[PDB]
Design a protein around this ligand. Structure first.
Ligand SMILES: CCCCC/C=C/C/C=C/C/C=C/C/C=C/CCCC(=O)O[C@@H](COC(=O)CCCCCCCCCCCCCCCCC)COP(=O)(O)O[C@@H]1[C@H](O)[C@H](O)[C@@H](OP(=O)(O)O)[C@H](OP(=O)(O)O)[C@H]1O
Ligand SMILES: *[C@@H]1O[C@H](CO)[C@@H](O)[C@H](O)[C@H]1NC(C)=O
Ligand SMILES: *[C@@H]1O[C@H](CO)[C@@H](O)[C@H](O)[C@H]1NC(C)=O
Ligand SMILES: *[C@@H]1O[C@H](CO)[C@@H](O)[C@H](O)[C@H]1NC(C)=O
Ligand SMILES: *[C@@H]1O[C@H](CO)[C@@H](O)[C@H](O)[C@H]1NC(C)=O
Ligand SMILES: *[C@@H]1O[C@H](CO)[C@@H](O)[C@H](O)[C@H]1NC(C)=O
Ligand SMILES: *[C@@H]1O[C@H](CO)[C@@H](O)[C@H](O)[C@H]1NC(C)=O
Ligand code: BEF
Ligand SMILES: [Mg+2]
Lengths: 214, 947
């Protein structure tokens, strides 16, 4: 079994200093063919050379760069050796929904995405009064379907009395945490009626001024 | 040394007519026969041989051919339309915007410049095409023997040279000017040149002046040519010939709007520069030595570009296209009232005209001698009666007497051209009686046909001493019948008896019966009429008296009919003049005819009333009084005459030109004058060119008068001048309705842009949205307001004037009042609109975000208020009811509904290109509510008295 000596794990902070990851193939009796870096199972572009000792440099380390890296060694007639260098950073929410405006009795969905390893756990908290309290499933209409990064919340049969408010999405990992807020609007069914009663309330005014003046 | 040069300059017998012609002839030269000896010609077999050298030497006088004008090509019309005061400025702004769009010192601009250029191209193309089509339509409507060597031979007209000896007969058209050698009582009609309705008699001594273009009506003679080419009286006037009142007002408004926009741009640039200077220099306190060199200049250039951007918003770009389409529509509508407009800029002038100068012969009268009232059988009819009024054989006797007495060569024929008055080819005064007979529904042709010239026994011809031509025949029976017509008193003195009543022929008594006929005839001549009477005589069968004896045959006549002959006024002229005078217009008559006929027709038409409050002059005494002792036309002398002058008689074309010029140029009155001139003759050529508007009679007008005019009356109806006034006041209204609607969009847009550039950093109204609002929607809005039908209540106002501003006080009140409401609503929706509608505020965006519902609501509301202001823009006075007559115009409703539907489509399915987001149903009814509030605010505005 080939021996690979890897660099220590690096935690990506707000520092702008570049980060270098190292693997050293100290012992190998097989004729090496090529090697490459991989992140989350995906080969990084332009990392295939001879590289008996290979380096990968991150010039602007960010939360999106952090992940489970590997330096794979492919030989002519030997099994590949992968090893692992884990890069950890606090989660950073990339995209969300600013607001969800929906009418009564439909389905409303809100989503949040995050980046960085380890993959964060998601907590949804509606803003009850001035504090963020956890939502309650006391009506059987809330569905939280959380995946590795994607996290969706669905509400069915929206009610104007309780549903409207602010919903917070939380992502927490070993290092840090971040959150975003979304405001949900539920519109009444008789909403178009009020402008209609005002449109013909000024038509009556128009056909009284003109006909009195003749 | 040199042969006799051109006659009109070196011996000016031309241009000086009357008895004064021979006055100069006798003192300077011989007896009009030595004048031929002066040239290389003789009265008999003149110009002995062709001799091409001699012909070419004589052709230095002229060619006898006037080259026709060359029609202008479409590209030439486009080139002429390009050079405008407004259109040059708009192109400059478009090029500036296009150039500054690409300035990115180390989308926007690409839209405004293209839109401006497209609108300019549309204006140019529409104007050029309309002028080309109108001129091409006009061109379609409009349209002899000489003694060469011994034996007379037909020669083409163009080869006539000075000295030619020409034989002229009846019905001919004179090709060139000349003198009179010898002839048998030539009578010619010079109404188209001189303006005199009376047929002129050319003799060797009284007036031997022959003019080109006049029609010789009776007699034959011999003439020698003197003025061949453009040197003739028609050619001189032809060669003398080659901005509107509305355009001056439009350019003045344009410069005022430009100055206002420039002030706004300067204010915004000053605000930005002051903000930068205050912020940076005070708090940070930069060294200001070398660091500022790139940064400060780039910032100042950016602020200047922002100011230039604000400047373009203020300028109205759809105004020229709106005016052009409104004018084109009005011209097309006016063409159906038998007014042919030629330049598309003359359709408005007649609306604001303050005076009219009218020719008499051909314009106010029919130029045809007719019998109007008649005294027959002791019954005087002021109007021509029906054929069976008296229903006696006396009418048969009258018809036979008129037909046989004279009707040999003088005949009346159908026009042979559809849409024209009946044409006569004989003596004009004689066919008045034939016209009377024809209008009595009796045919004179059978009577004439049965008696040829061979069967005529004796025909005594009208001459100097006889003065009463007569015809005596015998064939119908064994007795003799003689007919004699002539002057009233001349033939009445020889009327021993009179055929009185429907019964038996009574006797004529000079003591008592003469008083009644004098009392009948005197008012006739009082009203300007000419009295002609007819009588008949019978001779005994056995024996036969000596017909050479003129003593007895002249006397012993039985008078049968007395008629009144005149050149009548057109039937529609009196009421047309009455309607124009009520609209604030003053009508004056300028004519080349006598003073008595001019005064009579002026009394009949209604130009003057008895009392002599006004003044009537002649041509000679108008020139003498108009000039000072130095001999120069002084504007101070004209101002004493034209205010009170009503009739000008015996006036040269120069006199008409002088009068029109003096009226136009004078500043003595309170309001400056606009003068229109109506005509049909060549002598009206100059006056029709100097006037602001020129109307030319279509069927009766000549080529010179039709070419110099702007509007042609295709059916020469004087009541179609009143419809030119009412279509010119409707044009001016439909343009001031569009100014009310357009100038309230520009104020709101410029203030929103200024606030979004200075205070905030982005505007709710994008570029393509305002392209849709200003270019496409406002053009259709102007098309809708143009098609409002005119009404006969427009003819109750007074003319406005040359220097009255376009934007009146009520229009200013409307513009300001509606701008206040629109700005208040827009700002309220911009700053607190997301709390009312319960949506996300879209005030600040990262320029990488989809369109917001907060801003689409503002765009939709703005368009809705413009849509509902298109209704308030229909009343430019203080009218409360803006829905009056809305359904008489279906184009208005069609355009409004189409605009609303297209706006719905644009908002719903516009997307990112239009910067629009789809709206809900309840969010759209609020836009309609706010837009409909404009109508309710219009009444609040209208309540405020502008006085
Ligand atoms: C809407 O009203 O037009 C806007 C122009 O559109 C803009 O866009 C300009 C941007 C304005 C920004 C709004 C603040 C305001 O500018 P104007 O054109 O009104 O200003 C002229 C002129 O400046 C004098 O005021 C008057 O001239 P006079 O001295 O003779 O009274 C004249 O009136 P008249 O036609 O009677 O002569 C006015 O019209
Ligand atoms: C790199 O080159 C060396 C020297 O030839 C060789 O031993 C080694 O196997 C190569 N590694 C590759 C080709 O991956
Ligand atoms: C790791 O590899 C790099 C690159 O060849 C080399 O410089 C370094 O000395 C190696 N470190 C060890 C501990 O082998
Ligand atoms: C390398 O092989 C190991 C075998 O234990 C496996 O766990 C790892 O995921 C592999 N790495 C990659 C990048 O496939
Ligand atoms: C809420 O209860 C319903 C009961 O039908 C269930 O389907 C749903 O998954 C529950 N949601 C959560 C977040 O537990
Ligand atoms: C979320 O994870 C999936 C699966 O690994 C990946 O395809 C996707 O790009 C991730 N999304 C973001 C926003 O990082
Ligand atoms: C997210 O969750 C963590 C852990 O419960 C909590 O302490 C924190 O206040 C929440 N918000 C943020 C922004 O981290
Ligand atoms: F033809 Be008008 F009388 F000059
Ligand atoms: Mg005339």
């Amino acid at each position: 079994k080939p021996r690979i000596v890897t660099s220590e794990e690096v935690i990506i902070r707000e520092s702008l200093l570049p980060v270098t990851l190292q693997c050293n193939l100290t012992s190998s009796s097989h004729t090496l063919m090529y090697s490459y870096w991989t992140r989350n199972g995906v080969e990084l572009t332009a990392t295939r050379k001879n590289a008996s000792n290979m380096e990968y440099r991150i010039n602007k380390p960010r939360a999106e760069d952090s992940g489970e890296y590997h330096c794979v060694y492919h030989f002519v007639s030997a099994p590949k050796a992968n090893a692992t260098i884990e890069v950890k950073a606090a989660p950073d929410i990339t995209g969300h929904k600013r607001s969800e405006n929906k009418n009564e009795g439909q389905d409303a969905m809100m989503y949040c995405k995050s980046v960085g390893y380890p993959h964060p756990e998601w907590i949804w908290r509606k803003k009850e009064n001035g504090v963020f309290e956890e939502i309650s499933n006391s009506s059987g209409r809330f569905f939280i379907t959380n995946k590795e990064n994607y996290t969706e919340l669905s509400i069915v049969n929206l009610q104007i009395t309780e549903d409207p408010g602010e919903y917070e999405c939380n992502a927490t990992n070993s290092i840090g945490s971040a959150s975003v807020s979304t405001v949900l609007r539920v519109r009444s069914h008789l909403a178009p009626l009020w402008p209609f009663l005002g449109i013909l309330a000024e038509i009556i005014i128009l056909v009284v001024i003109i006909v009195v003046y003749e | 040394g040199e042969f006799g040069c051109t006659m009109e300059e070196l011996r000016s017998l031309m241009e000086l007519r009357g008895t004064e012609a021979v006055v100069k002839i006798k003192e300077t030269y011989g007896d009009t026969e030595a004048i031929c000896r002066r040239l290389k010609t003789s009265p008999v077999e003149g110009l002995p041989g062709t001799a091409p050298d001699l012909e070419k030497r004589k052709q230095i006088f002229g060619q006898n051919f006037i080259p026709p004008k060359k029609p202008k090509t479409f590209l030439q019309l486009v080139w002429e339309a390009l050079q405008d005061v407004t259109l040059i400025i708009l192109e400059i702004a478009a090029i500036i915007s296009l150039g500054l769009s690409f300035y990115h010192p180390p989308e926007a601009g690409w839209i405004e410049g293209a839109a401006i250029l497209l609108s300019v191209i549309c204006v140019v193309l529409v104007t050029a095409f309309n002028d080309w089509s109108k001129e091409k339509q006009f061109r379609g409507l409009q349209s002899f023997t000489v003694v060469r060597a011994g034996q007379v031979v037909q020669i083409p007209v163009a080869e006539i040279v000075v000295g030619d000896i020409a034989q002229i007969k009846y019905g001919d058209l004179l090709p060139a000017d000349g003198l009179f050698i010898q002839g048998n009582d030539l009578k010619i009609d010079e109404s188209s040149l001189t303006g005199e309705s009376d047929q002129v008699r050319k003799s060797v001594d009284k007036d031997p002046m022959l003019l080109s273009g006049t029609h010789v009506m009776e007699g034959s003679g011999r003439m020698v040519v003197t003025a061949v080419g453009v040197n003739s009286q028609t050619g001189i006037i032809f060669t003398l010939l080659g901005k509107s009142v509305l355009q001056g007002k439009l350019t003045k408004l344009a410069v005022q709007i430009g100055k206002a926009g420039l002030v706004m741009s300067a204010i915004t640039v000053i605000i930005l520069v002051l903000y930068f200077t205050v912020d940076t220099f005070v708090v940070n306190k930069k060294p200001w030595l070398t660091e500022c060199t790139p940064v400060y200049v780039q910032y100042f250039v950016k602020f200047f570009i922002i100011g230039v951007t604000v400047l373009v918003v203020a300028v109205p770009e759809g105004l020229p296209l709106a005016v052009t389409i409104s004018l084109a529509y009005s011209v097309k509508k006016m063409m159906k009232d038998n007014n042919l407009v030629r330049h598309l800029d003359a359709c408005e002038t007649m609306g604001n005209a303050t005076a009219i100068c009218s020719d008499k012969t051909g314009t106010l009268t029919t130029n045809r001698m007719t019998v109007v009232q008649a005294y027959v059988g002791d019954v005087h009819y002021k109007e021509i009666p029906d054929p069976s009024s008296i229903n006696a054989k006396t009418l048969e006797l009258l018809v036979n007497a008129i037909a046989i007495n004279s009707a040999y060569t003088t005949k009346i024929l159908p026009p042979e051209k559809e849409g024209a008055l009946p044409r006569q080819v004989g003596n004009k005064t004689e066919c008045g009686l034939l016209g009377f007979v024809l209008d009595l529904r009796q045919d004179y042709e059978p009577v004439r046909s049965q008696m040829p010239e061979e069967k005529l026994y004796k025909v005594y011809t009208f001459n100097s001493v006889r003065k009463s031509m007569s015809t005596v025949i015998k064939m119908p029976d064994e007795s003799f019948r003689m007919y004699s017509k002539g002057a009233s008193e001349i033939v009445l003195k020889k009327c021993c008896k009179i055929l009185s009543g429907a019964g038996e022929a009574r006797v004529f008594r000079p003591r008592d019966r003469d008083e009644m006929v004098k009392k009948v005839i005197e008012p006739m001549a009082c009203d300007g009429l000419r009295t002609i009477c007819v009588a008949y005589r019978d001779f005994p069968s056995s024996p036969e008296p000596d017909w050479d004896n003129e003593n007895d045959i002249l006397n012993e006549l039985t008078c049968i009919c007395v008629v009144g002959i005149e050149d009548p006024v057109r039937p529609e002229v009196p009421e047309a003049i009455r309607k124009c005078q009520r609209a604030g217009i003053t009508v004056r008559m300028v004519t080349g005819d006598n003073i008595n006929t001019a005064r009579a027709i002026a009394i009949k038409c209604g130009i003057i009333h008895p009392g002599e409050d006004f003044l009537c002059l002649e041509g000679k005494e108008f020139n003498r009084r108009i000039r000072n002792e130095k001999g120069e036309i002084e504007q101070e002398r004209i101002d004493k005459i034209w205010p009170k002058l009503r009739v000008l008689a015996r006036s040269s074309p120069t006199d008409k030109h002088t009068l029109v010029k003096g009226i136009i140029d004078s500043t003595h009155t309170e309001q400056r004058q606009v003068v229109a001139v109506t005509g049909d003759g060549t002598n009206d050529g100059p006056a029709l060119k100097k006037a602001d508007v020129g109307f030319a009679m279509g069927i009766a007008g000549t080529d010179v008068a039709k070419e110099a005019s702007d509007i042609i009356l295709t059916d020469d109806n004087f009541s179609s001048i009143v419809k030119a006034v009412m279509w010119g006041r409707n044009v001016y209204d439909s343009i001031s309705k569009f100014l009310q609607f357009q100038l309230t969009v520009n104020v709101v847009a410029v203030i929103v842009a200024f606030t979004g550039a200075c205070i905030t950093q982005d505007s709710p109204l994008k570029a393509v949205q305002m392209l849709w609002v200003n270019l496409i929607m406002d053009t259709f809005a102007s098309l809708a307001l143009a098609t409002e039908p005119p009404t006969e209540t427009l003819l109750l106002r007074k003319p406005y004037g040359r220097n009255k501003p376009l934007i009146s006080r009520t229009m200013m009140k409307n513009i300001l009042g509606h701008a206040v409401y629109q700005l208040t609503l827009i700002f309220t929706l911009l700053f607190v609109g997301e709390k009312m509608f319960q949506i996300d505020s879209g005030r600040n965006a990262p320029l990488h975000s989809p369109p917001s519902e907060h801003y689409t609501i503002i765009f939709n509301t703005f368009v809705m208020m413009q849509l509902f202001n298109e209704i308030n823009a229909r009343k430019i006075h203080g009218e409360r009811n803006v829905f009056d007559g809305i359904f008489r115009n279906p184009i208005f409703c069609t355009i409004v509904l189409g605009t609303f539907a297209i706006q719905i489509v644009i908002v719903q399915f516009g997307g990112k290109p239009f910067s629009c987001s789809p709206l809900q149903l309840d969010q759209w009814m609020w836009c309609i509510f706010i837009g409909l509030g404009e109508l309710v605010w219009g009444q609040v505005i209208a309540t405020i008295p502008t006085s």
